[PDB]
With several copies, the nearest count.
Chain A
C-alpha cells in the first residue's frame, strides 16, 4: 500500500495553506471562546457578526505570523521542529 515519507505531506500542506486565505479555526468554538473571555470584562454583552469575524481574522493573522517567527527560531537552533521555547523566544524578542 502507498505511504508518503515523513515530511512530504507536511510540505504539501504548507504549500496548500500558504496558497489559500480561508479561516483555519472553526467558527463556533472561536465564537464561544470570544463570548467567554468577553464575559469577564463586561456583563450582558452582545456581538455584531462582523465583530467576531474581525477578531478571528486578527487572531489567525497573529498566530500565523508568530509561527513564522517561531519557525525561524527553531531553524536558528538547527532544528526543523518548533517547540514551546521557540515560541517563548519569539514572544520575548517581540516585546510580548
Chain B
C-alpha cells in the first residue's frame, strides 16, 4: 500500500509547481492512480531491460532507456 506514501500535501506541492491554486478533494486519489500507472509502465520496461541483460540490479541506464522508449527522455543520469 505504498502508493499512499504519495501524500495529500505532496500532491498539493506538485500541483503548486504546476501553477494550481485550488484543488478538489477527489484529485488526490485520482492523482495516485495516474501516478501508479505511469510508474508501472516505466518500471515494467526498465525491468525488462534488466532481465535481458541477465542482471538482478536495475540500473539508472535501464530507467533512462525505458523513459526514452516511452518518449520521456531524461537528462542527467547517464554514466
**Complex: chain A residue closest to B74, CB-CB:** A58
Cβ of B70 to closest chain A Cβ, rounded Å: 9
B77/A45 in contact, CB under 8 A: no
Q: How many residues of B contact A (CB 8 A)?
A: 50
> Which of A18, A36, A87 is B16 in contact with, Cβ under 8 Å?
A18
Which A residues touch B26, using CB under 8 A?
A: 83-84
B2/A65 in contact, CB under 8 A: no
A34/B59 in contact, CB under 8 A: no
Q: Is the interface of A mostly helix, strand, loop or mixed?
A: helix
B5/A30 in contact, CB under 8 A: yes
Cβ of B61 to closest chain A Cβ, rounded Å: 8
Given known A48-B58, A51-B60, A54-B63, contact A68–B42 (CB-CB < 8 A)? no
B39/A42 in contact, CB under 8 A: no
Chain B proximity mask over A40-71: 1 for CB below 8 Å, otherwise 0: 01101111101101110111111111111011
**Complex: chain A residue closest to B22, CB-CB:** A81
B residues sitting closer than 8 Å to A (CB atoms) are 2-3, 5-7, 10-24, 26-27, 30-31, 34-36, 38-40, 42-44, 46-47, 50-51, 56-60, 62-64, 67, 72, 74, 76-77
A residues sitting closer than 8 Å to B (CB atoms) are 7, 10-11, 13-14, 16-18, 24-26, 28-30, 32-34, 36-38, 41-42, 44-48, 50-51, 53-55, 57-68, 70-71, 74, 80-84, 87-88, 91
